[PDB]
RNA sequence: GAGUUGAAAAUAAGCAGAGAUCCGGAGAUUCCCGAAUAGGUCAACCUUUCGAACUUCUGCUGAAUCCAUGGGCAGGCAAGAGACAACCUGGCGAACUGAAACAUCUUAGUAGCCAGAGGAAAAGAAAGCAAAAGCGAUUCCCGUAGUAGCGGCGAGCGAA
RNA sequence: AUCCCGUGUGAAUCAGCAAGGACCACCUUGCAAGGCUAAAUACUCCUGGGUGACCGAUAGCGAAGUAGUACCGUGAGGGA
RNA sequence: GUGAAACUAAGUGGAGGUCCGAACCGACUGAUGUUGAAGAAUCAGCGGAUGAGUUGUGGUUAGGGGUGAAAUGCCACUCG
RNA sequence: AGUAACGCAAACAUUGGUGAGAAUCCAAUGCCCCGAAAACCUAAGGGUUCCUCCGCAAGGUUCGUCCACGGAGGGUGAGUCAGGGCCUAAGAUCAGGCCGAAAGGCGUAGUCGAUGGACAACAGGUGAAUAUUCCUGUACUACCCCUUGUUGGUCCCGAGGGACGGAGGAGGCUAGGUUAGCCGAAAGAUGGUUAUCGGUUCAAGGACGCAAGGUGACCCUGUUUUUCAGGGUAAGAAGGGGUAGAGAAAAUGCCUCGAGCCAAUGUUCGAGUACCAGGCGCUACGGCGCUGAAGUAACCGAUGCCAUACUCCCAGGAAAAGCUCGAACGACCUUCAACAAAAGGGUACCUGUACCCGAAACCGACACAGGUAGGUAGGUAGAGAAUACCUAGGGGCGCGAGACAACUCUCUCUAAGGAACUCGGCAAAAUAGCCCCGUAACUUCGGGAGAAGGGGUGCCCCCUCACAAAGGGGGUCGAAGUGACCAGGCCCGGGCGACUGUUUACCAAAAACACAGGUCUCCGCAAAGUCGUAAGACCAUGUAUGGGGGCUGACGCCUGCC
């Protein structure tokens, strides 16, 4: 059997369909969350992925 | 001949139960895909003959269905009655004589006849008495109504200009086809139902304590509080078309 | 009208050659040479910007992204043109 | 008016006593995402008939229906969308608490949520107060006053 | 009582109607069922000046360096 | 074997919520381990293993709720 | 307190090398471990951990010259592989439309959305890090140009097709394996011996074609109907083709022609002036350079292909585009414009590509005795993917060395007895594979059942031989013959639950839940019931032989009184 571990190896595409910027901007509630993120000063207001490339580092 | 291009394809997915996603028609899920059969309830081609070539098993029904051709180039499915000889010819119409398998409006026929597929008003597809042996009889007619004894022990005066497929609908032997494999209930997309005594008081009103709990309430109730014996769930003023309940 | 996929300031579509030893291996062994281009570039826009500014028929344009962000382009010229005689003129 | 190419030294080349660097006013550019707006999108990408999409305005043609309406086509520096800490207005709107419990009441029309809008908003020019004497739109402060009251006439609430 | 709404009934124009704390009579006051208006007024994400019986790196903004940063959480968010 | 039935040797067939047993799924007993190698495991056996199966990927129901072959179980090591 | 521990009990040891310093880094030789992996590749995730050089401040449960660590530089090459430029499922967003304090809820067209459908590349070499991507060979897609014809063509529309289940076993073969033949080498200090050791490889694709495989319709004759021998039919296959109705295609009805058809496999080209054992010449001793033999046959035999092939069953098995065919109606362009081909050339869209991926790099805070979809499945013994030992390939588990106290833990044996221990045979011990004999009470006649119980088993001879398994008789050893691993303990009663299953992730797997079956009761479709202020949705694209809800729980006898 497995352990009581919660996060696993789910694709970042499906994590970006739920917690990404689009479903965060498709509601009044989620854009109010982005009022609180931009009002606080977070450098990364979402946790996303990209349809083209991985990372520029 | 399977894949008739009349099986009509796309459906709502299986034996669904989701309105907004909440369980609202309980104990559903499982089984095959069960692709439906778009059959011809309201026969829109009157006074043209049509043979019977195939008795196909509809998984959506309790009975069978049958593939009927025409003299013109078409294919339909209809509910075949008891006594569907292979190759026999059925024909809808207004003055077509009475045969086990054809359709006609409810006026041009005698009284005291076995009919399965009747209409409750004009224009609809087909409503009443279309199960695997559901047979409706006719008591005598009236000016614009017709007292019809449908297979519940229930009579109903109805609009006389309604289509009706005369015949006793077949596959009666599902009264005795036992489900004795005991997991064949799950093959029909029917999950097991839990019982009200063995639940908790947050779930069912008969959530008990120690032991096999007696029913406790003054009446055996549903899981939403209404009494589940004798309490007729019917609006007091809808139609007043039924003569006597007779039940 | 013949539109490209994106209008991308064609006199800046190439940035710099690559002067590693493996690039000279690609010159002497492949008749190819190495350029660094921006990410917004094509196998149709770079390939046109070689047959015009240089004057050489280019055979293929094998591109790749590099994880520091910028894009790397192996351009292979035709058999008729040596990459060594056309790379010493630039300074390789 | 004398040195400069940010922090930030060094190096390579410049720019400058026909006035550089810098400061100030007005302009220009502003890739991509984001109202994001050609269409899709898993934001900063893809596909592209390279497009202010949609609503509103203007103009032509003008369905079922004669006039209409809907639609389509076109024009337009083109009006709106989005953002905004707190105050303000409008709507939904509690509960812990106090009453030594608690339901009327209080906390409280407060918090919170949504919408809108300006540097203020709301209100505002008497079908008003007052009392036989008189005042002259609204708002705010001191006061009357913790008064008259209201209230399981409890806890409290409290004007004019 | 005054003021505003839900259902239903449903007036009068100045010789009138409404208010003056149920209501009636007299007097007094005003003219609803149409709109618009600056000022005094409340506040700080700020800006420009002047101050401080305010702090001095466990304080003062969470933050005197990468500060809402490293780090934690799937996320809301928490947070040096 | 009788004019047909009722029924039976013998092959052929491969049904099963069949049996033994691997992967796989699950956790019955015992020992160990309890500042553990591990916030639930190791070792020795154990139950199912063609099904009311198991699992990947993309989804769905969201807290006066969901879901539950029903234990107050589970809903991100948190659930009257 | 300088105490426990240093993360399995696969195991290391020595000689050299590097250095200031070596159990730990490197090299060699033995030894040992996994080997349905502790091997290789890819999905996810991670994000630079990959490679050269330099360093040993911190990290590595020790050290360190080493490193998944620090610094500098480099590395991921696609028309064919995987996604997008194509299509849709679940689902989401939903123009208008209905509803609703707001936010928004319902819902149609439409658009997204792979885990699916459609579409074109394989072999050898290169290489500190890349290979279906770079080089060379042969290919294949999608458009343009070059030659013949056509005046209409494209899209929308009409249709076929795409297009689909589970189980079962039998064929025909390939992939692999073993043996033999062939080729090269070999004296491996031992009694004998060459009986020994290594190769015996080749893909995609282009052409030709299929039987002793399946399918091809009916009847008789011979045989076990069957493989085949023989006659007749004018439809009886894959397939085409005419018509008839409002009928272009299609569909339906009628008529006619066709004895063959289908697909893995196969021969040749690709394909040898490749690959390859070996020897030949120098070592920075890490490898390069020249030349090169045979490259066949048979037995097994796949879990891979034929193959969505047949047979059986109910629980009845996605959609759309690509593709093919086609009239009217509708939008646009028209002659060197459009369409269909035949050879030959030209052209080749974005992203992913490193590395780990049965893990030190992912998820468990750890370089954590745990978890993670999928693919390849060698030899011997075995029915086998278990097991035991091994080839390939990869490791020796990141603290060691002494000693051989008590005591804990993981194992082995134990005189005599055999449960006397104990809450309780808990745990251990014992049985164990294949064949033959034999098997009771009871029963729902299905079972119990592998009941129980007993015997043989290794290896050499012979003969009978279905002439492969196998049988009998004989001899031979050992105390012991499925001699290791592996591999049922059973019976007699009773209580409960009929049963297989499900249940408290992390103290309860049960007698609890469910179940097939029974009964009551509600429901006539604008149904009942459920969620939502509402619109509406499930019910249900179903219709009382159906859909809720209550209780009981197969089956057999019944279920009394109020």
Could you walk me through the main structural features you see in this protein, from its secondary elements to its overall organization?
- Chain C: It is found in: Plastid, Chloroplast.
- Chain C: This is Large ribosomal subunit protein uL23c.
- This is part of a larger assembly, with chains A (57 residues), B (247 residues) and C (92 residues).
- By secondary structure, chain A is mainly alpha-helical.
- Chain A has a single domain, classed as Helix Hairpins (Orthogonal Bundle), CATH 1.10.287.
- Chain A has 3 helices and no strands.
- The longest helix of chain A is centred in the middle third of the chain and has 13 residues, at 28-40.
- Chain A is extended and about 45 Å long.
- Chain B is mainly beta.
- Chain B has 2 domains: 1-91, OB fold (Dihydrolipoamide Acetyltransferase, E2P) (Beta Barrel), CATH 2.40.50; 92-247, no CATH class.
- Chain B has one helix at residues 184-187, and strands at residues 54-56, 65-68, 76-78, 103-105, 115-118, 137-141, 145-150, 154-159, 163-166.
- A 3-stranded antiparallel sheet of chain B has the order 1-2-3, with no helix packed on it. A 3-stranded antiparallel sheet of chain B has the order 4-9-5, with no helix packed on it.
- Chain C is α+β, with helices and mostly antiparallel strands and 92 residues long.
- Chain C has one domain (13-92): 2-Layer Sandwich (Alpha-Beta Plaits).
- Chain C is built from 3 helices and 4 strands, in the order E-H-E-H-E-E-H.
- Chains A and C meet through loops of A and loops of C.
- Chain B binds 4 RNA strands through helix 1.
Number of domains of chain A: 1
Q: What distance separates the N and C termini of chain B?
A: 44 Å
SS content category of chain A: mainly alpha
Examine the coordinates and then state which fold CATH places here, giving the name of the CATH topology of chain A: Helix Hairpins
Please compute the radius of gyration of chain A using only Cα atoms: 14 Å
* Tally of DSSP helical segments of chain A: 3
Number of strands of chain B: 9
**Helix/sheet category of chain B:** mainly beta
Proportion of residues in β-strands of chain B: 15-25%
Q: What would the principal axes of the Cα set say about the shape of chain B? A: globular
Question: Measured on Cα atoms, how large is the radius of gyration of chain B?
Answer: 22 Å
State the largest interface. Answer: A-C, 5 and 4 residues
Q: What's the helix-strand series of chain B?
A: EEEEEEEEEH
Protein name (chain A): Large ribosomal subunit protein bL34c
Family (chain A): Belongs to the bacterial ribosomal protein bL34 family.
Subcellular location (chain A): Plastid, Chloroplast
Organism (chain A): Spinacia oleracea
